[PDB]
């Protein structure tokens, strides 16, 4: 209700202690029950997976982008929006993203 678009309920089950797991992550277009979600650095480049910009190929539309690392994701949130990662290169220094405003 707080934004009028859907979440996908994800479990997430991995261990340790502290271990932390859960929950209702932001939906992308095309996420369905029974699809796999991968969250991290060597996640597959598939819609719905989360990973650092460095790992993403240039020219791929992304959402829930961080301002700052581990803030978990700020830019591209609202319904049908997306940022576009234009540049990287192996960019040690900077990844250039275009937000939906341009």
Partner 1 sequence: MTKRTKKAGIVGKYGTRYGASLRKQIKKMEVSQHSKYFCEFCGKFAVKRKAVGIWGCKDCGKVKAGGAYTMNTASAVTVRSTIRRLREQTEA
Partner RNA sequence: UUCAUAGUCAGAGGUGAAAUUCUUGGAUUUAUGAAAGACGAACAACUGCGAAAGCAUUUGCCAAGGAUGUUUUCAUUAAUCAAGAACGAAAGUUGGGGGCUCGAAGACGAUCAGAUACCGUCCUAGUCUCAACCAUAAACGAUGCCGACCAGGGAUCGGCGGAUGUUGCUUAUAGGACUCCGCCGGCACCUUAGAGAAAUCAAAGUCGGUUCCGGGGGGAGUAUGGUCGCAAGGCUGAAACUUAA
Residues in contact with RNA by the rule CB under 7 A: 58-61, 76, 79-89, 91, 96, 98-100, 102
What is the Cα–Cα distance from 26 to 48, expressed in whole angstroms?
9
Q: Considering CB distances under 5 to 8 angstroms, the limit depending on partner class, which of partner 1, RNA, none binds residue 81?
A: RNA
Distances (CA, A) of 50 to 25, 57, 101, 102: 10, 13, 22, 23
- What x/- string results for residues 58 through 97 when contact with partner 1 is judged by CB under 8 A? xxxx-----------------xx-x---------------
**Residue 4 in tokens:** 């009028």
**Residue 11 in tokens:** 């479990």
What is the Cα–Cα distance from 90 to 6, expressed in whole angstroms?
34
Q: Check: CB of residue 41 under 8 Å from CB of residue 51.
A: yes
Confirm or reject binding of residue 30 to partner 1 (CB under 8 A): yes
Q: Considering CB distances under 5 to 8 angstroms, the limit depending on partner class, which of RNA, partner 1, none binds residue 86?
A: RNA
Interface with partner 1 (CB under 8 A): 4-6, 8, 27-34, 44-47, 57-61, 79-80, 82
């Amino acid at each position: 209700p707080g934004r009028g678009a859907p979440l996908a309920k994800v479990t997430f089950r991995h261990p340790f202690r502290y271990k932390h797991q859960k929950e209702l992550f932001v939906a992308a277009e095309g996420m369905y029950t029974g699809q796999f979600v991968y969250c991290g650095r060597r996640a597959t480049l598939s819609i719905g997976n989360v990973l650092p910009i460095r790992s993403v190929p240039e020219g791929a539309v992304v959402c829930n982008v961080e301002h700052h690392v581990g803030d978990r994701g700020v830019f591209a949130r609202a319904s049908g929006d997306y940022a576009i990662v234009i540049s990287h290169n192996p960019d040690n220094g900077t990844s250039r993203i275009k937000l939906p405003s341009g």
